[PDB]
């Protein structure tokens, strides 16, 4: 590993919903929550041996936190990931999650071009139990900005993005659950796909430590494997990492 290129620096964005409902309308409470979360996720990454040997020490650090204290005012017909209303249905608590990720990536494009990853932290109840979403590791995008020309947006956006909501089914999720969401989405960013039932090594039973973090169904977090990457994830990311590290990773602060 290259100690000058072992860290994926993040632009972390807290939208007005997160500021209000997790941050208590305070900058300090908002930034402390995120700093602590990313540091705990970093512990997972940094300790992961991508080959099962000496290939560990890769992780994540926050470069900047943008704190949006109030909604983005918009004109009729215009949308923005930080606007007051949900889209496409203003009557729902939350956006359609795929549309929200696309919109965030559009709005943050200038900033996203200058960082390894951008991640949106929000507080809205996505339909049917969804907690987050990311580009990369889908059967493209992920670490290091990769351009996509949006025919609808009429400009390049970058696919180095993901999001986490800390609201689900009308309440704030546990911190131990929040850590898992952000680890999972960053896992896609690093190149992992979902762990399949058909590979027992990558999706163990409850009495063998339970599921690993890239399982498609939320790992509740009290089982041994829940906060670890499966061997499937490791192999996938291992192809990602060194290449991408040279491309956009920096020295750990
Ligand atoms: C951290 C989790 C694993 C993220 C995934 C979504 C995902 O794959 N993002 O990259 C999720 O929200 N999964 C949901 C999930 O497991 N939600 C749990 C909390 C849930 O609703 N459990 C009860 C069944 N409705 C789904 C969509 C499967 C319902
Ligand atoms: Ca939800
Ligand atoms: Zn996923």
From Swiss-Prot:
One of its GO terms (molecular function) is tumor necrosis factor binding. Keywords: Cell membrane, Cleavage on pair of basic residues, Disulfide bond, Glycoprotein, Hydrolase, Membrane, Metal-binding, Metalloprotease, Notch signaling pathway, Phosphoprotein, Protease, SH3-binding, Signal, Transmembrane, Transmembrane helix, Zinc, Zymogen. Induction: In arthritis-affected cartilage. Its main location: membrane. Zn(2+) binds at residues 184, 188, 194. GO terms for cellular component: actin cytoskeleton; apical plasma membrane; cell surface; cytoplasm; cytosol; endoplasmic reticulum lumen; Golgi membrane; membrane. Ubiquitously expressed. Expressed at highest levels in adult heart, placenta, skeletal muscle, pancreas, spleen, thymus, prostate, testes, ovary and small intestine, and in fetal brain, lung, liver and kidney. Expressed in natural killer cells (at protein level). Coiled coil: none annotated. The active site is at 185. It comes from the Eukaryota. It is found in: Cell membrane. Residues 6-253 form the Peptidase M12B domain. Glycans are attached at residues 47, 231. One of its GO terms (biological process) is B cell differentiation. Disulfide bonds join 8-116, 144-248, 202-232. The precursor is cleaved by a furin endopeptidase. Must be membrane anchored to cleave the different substrates. The cytoplasmic domain is not required for the this activity. Only the catalytic domain is essential to shed TNF and p75 TNFR. The conserved cysteine present in the cysteine-switch motif binds the catalytic zinc ion, thus inhibiting the enzyme. The dissociation of the cysteine from the zinc ion upon the activation-peptide release activates the enzyme. Transmembrane metalloprotease which mediates the ectodomain shedding of a myriad of transmembrane proteins including adhesion proteins, growth factor precursors and cytokines important for inflammation and immunity. Cleaves the membrane-bound precursor of TNF-alpha to its mature soluble form. Responsible for the proteolytical release of soluble JAM3 from endothelial cells surface. It is linked to Inflammatory skin and bowel disease, neonatal, 1: A disorder characterized by inflammatory features with neonatal onset, involving the skin, hair, and gut. The skin lesions involve perioral and perianal erythema, psoriasiform erythroderma, with flares of erythema, scaling, and widespread pustules. Gastrointestinal symptoms include malabsorptive diarrhea that is exacerbated by intercurrent gastrointestinal infections. The hair is short or broken, and the eyelashes and eyebrows are wiry and disorganized. This is Disintegrin and metalloproteinase domain-containing protein 17. The chain holds residues 218 to 474 of 824 of the full protein.
């Amino acid at each position: 590993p290259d100690p000058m290129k072992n860290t994926c620096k993040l632009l972390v964005v807290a939208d007005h919903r997160f500021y209000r409902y997790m941050g208590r309308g305070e900058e300090s409470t908002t930034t402390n929550y995120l700093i602590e979360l990313i540091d705990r996720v970093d512990d997972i990454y940094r300790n992961t041996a991508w080959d099962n040997a000496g290939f560990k020490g890769y992780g994540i650090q926050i470069e900047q936190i943008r704190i949006l204290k109030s909604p983005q005012e918009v004109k009729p017909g215009e949308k923005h990931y930080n606007m007051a209303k949900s889209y496409p249905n203003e009557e729902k608590d939350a956006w359609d999650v795929k549309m929200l990720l696309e919109q965030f990536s559009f709005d943050i494009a200038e900033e996203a071009s200058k960082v390894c990853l951008a991640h949106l932290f929000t507080y809205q109840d996505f339909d049917m139990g969804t907690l987050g979403l990311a580009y990369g590791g889908s059967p493209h995008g992920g670490v290091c900005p990769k351009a996509y020309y949006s025919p609808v947006g009429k400009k390049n956006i970058y696919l180095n993005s993901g999001l986490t909501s800390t609201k689900n089914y009308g309440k704030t999720i546990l911190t131990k659950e929040a850590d898992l969401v952000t680890t999972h989405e960053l896992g896609h960013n690093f190149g992992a796909e979902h762990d399949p039932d058909g590979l027992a090594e990558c999706a163990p039973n409850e009495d063998q430590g339970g599921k690993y973090v890239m399982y498609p169904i939320a790992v509740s977090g009290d089982h041994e494997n829940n906060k670890m990457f499966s061997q499937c994830s490791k192999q996938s990311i291992y192809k990602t990492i060194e290449s991408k590290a040279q491309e956009c990773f920096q020295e750990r602060s």
